[PDB]
Structure formats: structure tokens, C-alpha cells
Amino acid sequence: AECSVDIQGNDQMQFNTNAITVDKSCKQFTVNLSHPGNLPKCVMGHNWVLSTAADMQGVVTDGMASGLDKDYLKPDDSRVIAHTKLIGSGEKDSVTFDVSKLKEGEQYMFFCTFPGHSALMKGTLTLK
């Protein structure tokens, strides 16, 4: 099975998918993030961040408070399983993580931590 997914974050503050399925036969999984919009990072920046459903709110809250210079993520946040950098218009970034970090049955969420975006930019990730 394939072990990567291409995701886009646009100016309408949205991801082009709300669900990701990671096949258990994958050893590593790659997420390619691109920003096909025209707005800069400081105004419409997006990142793809993965945590358990329970940790999401905490990550989003501390991230918001951390500021743009920290890509809106609290430094040394052990709750973040994987994440891309915060990108703006015309940029792209990829993150590859070990699937062994995921456990079956557990609920995972991916989201953007730029202030307010997680309201719409979020989705589930499942290991099947």
C-alpha cells in the first residue's frame, strides 16, 4: 500500500481532506504539505500537526501563545507526534514519521496551529 499523502492548505483556511488512513503495513508515513494560496505565512500560514485527540486542544492552545517565530508550537512539546513547518503562499514541506509511533485503537487528530485555524483545519488519522 502507499505510505504518503499530499495535503493542501489554502487561503480559504481549509485542508483538502479531513481524514487520513495509514495502512499498518507501512513502516514510515510521509505527509507532503503545500500552500497554493497567495497570502503570506504571517496572515494565512499553515502547518500539519499530529497528536492524540486528547492532546489536540492543549497543543493548539500553547501553540497559539508561542507566536509566529516558533511556528505556533510550544518548544519541546512532547505531545506532538509529528509536524511540518509553518508555511505560507507558494511554499511546501514534508514530514516523514515512523508508523510504530502510532497504536491501533487510539484516536489521532491532525490540525493547523496558526491562531484560529484548527476550528476548520483539522481531521482524523487512523492506523488500519
Ligand X SMILES: *C1=CC(=O)N(COCN2C(=O)C=C(*)C2=O)C1=O
Q: Are strands 49-52 and 28-34 parallel, antiparallel or unpaired?
A: unpaired
Cα distance between residue 87 and residue 50, in whole Å:
16
Question: Residue 94 corresponds to which cell in the numbers above?
Answer: 514534508
1 binds, among a copy of itself, ligand X, Ni ion, none (CB under 5 to 8 A by kind): Ni ion
**DSSP-based three-state secondary structure for 74:** coil
The one-letter code for the residue type at 37 is: G
Give the interface with a copy of itself as residue ranges (CB under 8 A).
11-14, 39, 42-44, 64, 68, 115-117, 119-120
Smaller CB separation from ligand X, 10 or 51: 10
39 binds, among Ni ion, Cu ion, a copy of itself, none (CB under 5 to 8 A by kind): a copy of itself
Q: Does 40 bind ligand X (CB under 6 A)?
A: yes
Helix (H) or strand (E) holding 31: strand 28-34
Q: Does 42 bind ligand X (CB under 6 A)?
A: yes
**Among 15, 31, 35, 46, interactor with Cu ion by CB under 5 A:** 46
Residues in the chain preceding a C-to-N separation beyond 2.5 angstroms (breaks): none
Residue 112, annotated ligand binder? yes
Residues that bind ligand X (CB under 6 A): 40-43
